[PDB]
Design an enzyme around this catalytic site. Structure first.
Site, mmCIF file in Angstrom:
data_model
loop_
_atom_site.group_PDB
_atom_site.id
_atom_site.type_symbol
_atom_site.label_atom_id
_atom_site.label_comp_id
_atom_site.label_asym_id
_atom_site.label_seq_id
_atom_site.Cartn_x
_atom_site.Cartn_y
_atom_site.Cartn_z
ATOM 1 N N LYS B 36 0.811 -1.379 0.055
ATOM 2 C CA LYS B 36 0.159 0.012 -0.139
ATOM 3 C C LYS B 36 0.921 1.382 0.066
ATOM 4 C CE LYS B 36 -4.353 -2.473 1.584
ATOM 5 N NZ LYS B 36 -5.180 -2.617 0.195
ATOM 6 N N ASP B 108 -9.142 -3.233 13.432
ATOM 7 C CA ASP B 108 -10.101 -4.285 13.236
ATOM 8 C C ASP B 108 -9.703 -5.548 13.564
ATOM 9 O OD1 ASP B 108 -10.519 -3.562 9.656
ATOM 10 O OD2 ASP B 108 -8.845 -4.060 10.645
ATOM 11 N N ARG B 211 -7.491 -4.615 -9.109
ATOM 12 C CA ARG B 211 -6.157 -3.701 -8.878
ATOM 13 C C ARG B 211 -5.120 -3.785 -9.885
ATOM 14 N NH1 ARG B 211 -6.038 -2.118 -3.526
ATOM 15 N NH2 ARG B 211 -7.192 -3.345 -2.081
ATOM 16 N N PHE B 304 -19.809 -21.421 -1.763
ATOM 17 C CA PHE B 304 -18.590 -22.152 -2.084
ATOM 18 C C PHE B 304 -17.631 -22.268 -1.080
ATOM 19 C CE2 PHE B 304 -13.896 -21.138 -3.528
ATOM 20 C CZ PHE B 304 -13.689 -22.314 -4.118
ATOM 21 N N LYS B 305 -17.509 -21.354 -0.197
ATOM 22 C CA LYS B 305 -16.580 -21.437 0.924
ATOM 23 C C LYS B 305 -17.300 -22.403 2.100
ATOM 24 C CE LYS B 305 -15.031 -16.715 0.151
ATOM 25 N NZ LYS B 305 -14.644 -15.479 0.733
ATOM 26 N N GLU B 319 -15.037 -2.978 13.847
ATOM 27 C CA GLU B 319 -14.189 -1.650 13.947
ATOM 28 C C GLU B 319 -14.045 -0.900 15.163
ATOM 29 O OE1 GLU B 319 -15.445 0.274 10.094
ATOM 30 O OE2 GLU B 319 -14.133 -0.541 9.218
#
Ligand SMILES: [Mg+2]
Ligand SMILES: [Mg+2]
Ligand SMILES: [Mg+2]
EC number: 2.3.2.10
Lengths: 4, 335
Positions: B36, B108, B211, B304-305, B319
């Site tokens: 980042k 978090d 990205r 799926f998971k 948060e």
């Protein structure tokens, strides 16, 4: 999109 | 104290605490600032009497449409955040290093939601965002709070992925391999190019953003091949699907995926199987498939998971916000  | 990022010895000592901590997270490693690189890093830590680090918080500071920055410690700090008197101390060091530049310090951590911990944090002056803010949109949380985490310590004798699963799921996982899907893994530029093809194809097929490849290049330069690994499933020389996983702390985390259009021969199941096998082979406690919207059959992330994680999703505290400029906080943060 998000994340990572 | 604040970490001097220009002192390589200090930097290595901080990295050593982060890489060896049971609470370590790849997004709190200093390598995450390199990924980042458009954010400003500020990192703080506390020591014990013998001068060893006992707790650390890696922050990245990003811009807002105000004169204040947003300071974010993703999945940190690294310590037992339920020890709230130690967390307050750590946060006070962080607030000192931010020096009035940020309107909030948000963190978090991956610690279970509970009413008592929520209440404790609020009683300590933090603003918490969890059950009070559920939804998708400008106001939901940055990281999903519900996550599908396979606890491999429930299977201490497992040798291979299929040992963790009931026969009906062994059949699901066996299928792509039976149909000729083969998986290779590594962290070179060639696996990254495979990944990026599947990632931009998927993104075009869903009509979403992706990205730029430079982000993943930065990731590959910050993390070696024992931390970051790209898994590439193909069948008879045809590229099908890929995933990137990060091993850090007590978990391997499936962080990114891509898939080609059309017939993929259940290649994503083969990629999961191989990620899982890397967690077993390195004796890693948790395998994390990341977020879901709801524990519901209507949620395709969940569907799926849930092949891979039969237990309850983990629900984290969400948060935690140390409010620093209340006027700006109220402008920018709504439920
Ligand atoms: Mg600004
Ligand atoms: Mg093992
Ligand atoms: Mg399971």
């Amino acid at each position: 999109x998000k994340x990572x | 104290p604040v970490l001097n990022l220009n002192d390589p010895q200090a930097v290595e000592r901080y990295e050593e605490f982060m890489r060896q901590s049971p609470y370590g997270q790849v997004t709190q490693d200093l390598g995450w600032a390199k990924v980042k690189n458009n954010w400003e890093p500020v990192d703080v830590y506390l020591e014990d009497d013998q001068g060893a680090i006992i707790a650390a918080m890696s922050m990245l500071l990003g811009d807002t449409p105000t004169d204040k920055k947003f300071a974010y410690a993703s999945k940190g700090p690294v310590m037992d955040v339920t020890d709230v008197d130690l967390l307050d101390r750590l946060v006070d060091e962080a607030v000192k290093a931010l020096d009035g530049r940020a309107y909030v310090l948000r963190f978090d951590p991956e610690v279970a939601y509970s009413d008592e911990f929520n209440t404790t944090l609020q009683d300590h002056g933090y603003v918490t965002r969890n059950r009070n803010v559920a939804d998708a949109g400008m106001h939901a949380t940055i990281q999903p709070r519900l996550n599908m985490v396979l606890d491999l310590t429930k299977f201490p004798d497992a040798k291979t992925t299929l040992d963790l699963y009931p026969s009906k799921t062994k059949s699901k996982i066996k299928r792509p391999f039976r149909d000729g899907v083969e998986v290779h893994s590594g962290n070179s530029a060639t696996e990254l190019d495979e990944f990026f093809k599947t990632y931009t194809t998927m993104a075009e097929r869903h009509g979403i953003t992706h990205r730029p490849i430079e982000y993943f290049q930065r990731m590959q330069a910050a993390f070696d091949a024992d931390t970051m690994r790209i898994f590439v499933a193909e069948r008879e020389g045809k590229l099908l699907s890929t995933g990137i996983a990060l091993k850090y702390g007590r978990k391997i985390w499936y962080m990114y995926a891509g898939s080609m259009d059309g017939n993929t021969y259940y290649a994503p199941y083969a990629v999961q199987s191989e990620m899982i096998q890397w967690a077993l082979d390195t004796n890693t406690d948790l395998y994390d498939l990341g977020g879901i919207e709801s524990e519901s059959t209507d949620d395709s992330l969940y569907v799926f998971k849930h092949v891979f994680v039969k237990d309850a999703p983990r629900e984290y505290i969400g948060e935690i916000d140390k409010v620093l400029d209340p006027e700006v906080y109220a402008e920018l943060v709504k439920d």
